[PDB]
Short mmCIF file of C-alpha atoms in Angstrom, two decimals:
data_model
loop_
_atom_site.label_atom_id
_atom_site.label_comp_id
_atom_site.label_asym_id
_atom_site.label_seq_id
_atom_site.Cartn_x
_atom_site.Cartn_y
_atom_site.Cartn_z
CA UNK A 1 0.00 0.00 0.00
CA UNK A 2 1.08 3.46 -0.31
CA UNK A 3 1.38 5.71 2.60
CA UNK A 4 1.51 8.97 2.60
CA UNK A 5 3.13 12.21 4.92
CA UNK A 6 2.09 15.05 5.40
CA UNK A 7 4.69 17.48 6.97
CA UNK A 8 3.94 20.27 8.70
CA UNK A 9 7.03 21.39 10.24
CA UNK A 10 8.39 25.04 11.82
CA UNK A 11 11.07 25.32 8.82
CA UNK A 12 10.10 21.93 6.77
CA UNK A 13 6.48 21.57 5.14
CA UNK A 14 5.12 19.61 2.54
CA UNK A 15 4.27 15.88 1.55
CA UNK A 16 6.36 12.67 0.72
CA UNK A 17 5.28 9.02 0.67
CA UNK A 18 6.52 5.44 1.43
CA UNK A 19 5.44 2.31 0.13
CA UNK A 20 4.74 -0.74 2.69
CA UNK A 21 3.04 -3.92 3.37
CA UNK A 22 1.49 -2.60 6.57
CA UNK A 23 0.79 0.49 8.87
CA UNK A 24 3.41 0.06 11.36
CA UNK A 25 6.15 -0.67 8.72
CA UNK A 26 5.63 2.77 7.18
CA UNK A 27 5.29 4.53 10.49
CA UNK A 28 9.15 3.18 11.35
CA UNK A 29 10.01 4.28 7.96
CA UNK A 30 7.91 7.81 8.38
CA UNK A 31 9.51 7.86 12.18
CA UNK A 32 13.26 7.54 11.27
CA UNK A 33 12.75 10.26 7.85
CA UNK A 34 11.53 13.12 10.70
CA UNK A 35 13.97 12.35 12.68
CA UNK A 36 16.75 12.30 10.13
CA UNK A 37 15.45 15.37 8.69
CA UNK A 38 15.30 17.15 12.72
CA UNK A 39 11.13 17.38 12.83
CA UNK A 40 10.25 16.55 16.36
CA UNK A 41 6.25 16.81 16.26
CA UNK A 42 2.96 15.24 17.23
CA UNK A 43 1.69 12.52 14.95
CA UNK A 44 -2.02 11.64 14.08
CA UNK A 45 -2.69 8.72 11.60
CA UNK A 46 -6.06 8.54 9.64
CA UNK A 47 -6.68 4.72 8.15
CA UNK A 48 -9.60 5.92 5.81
CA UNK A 49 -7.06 8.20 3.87
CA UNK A 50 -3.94 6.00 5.22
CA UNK A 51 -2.36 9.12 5.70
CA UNK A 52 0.22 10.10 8.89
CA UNK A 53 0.47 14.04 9.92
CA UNK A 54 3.30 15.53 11.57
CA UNK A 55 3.48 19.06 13.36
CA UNK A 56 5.42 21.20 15.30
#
């Protein structure tokens, strides 16, 4: 499935996406990208639109 982030960061905003065989996979994959990228936020997911949000 494809997953998709949305990034709404102080200095970073936009959208990227992962592909992934399940939620949690992409959420490591979503989880290690913010952090490699210096986002530390609050996440929501939404499994109708499989869609993760991040903000600062």
């Amino acid at each position: 499935m494809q997953y998709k982030l949305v990034i709404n960061g102080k200095t970073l905003k936009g959208e990227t996406t992962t592909k992934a065989v399940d939620a949690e996979t992409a959420e490591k994959a979503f989880k290690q990208y913010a952090n490699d990228n210096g986002v530390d936020g609050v996440w929501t997911y939404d499994d109708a639109t499989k869609t993760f949000t991040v903000t600062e």
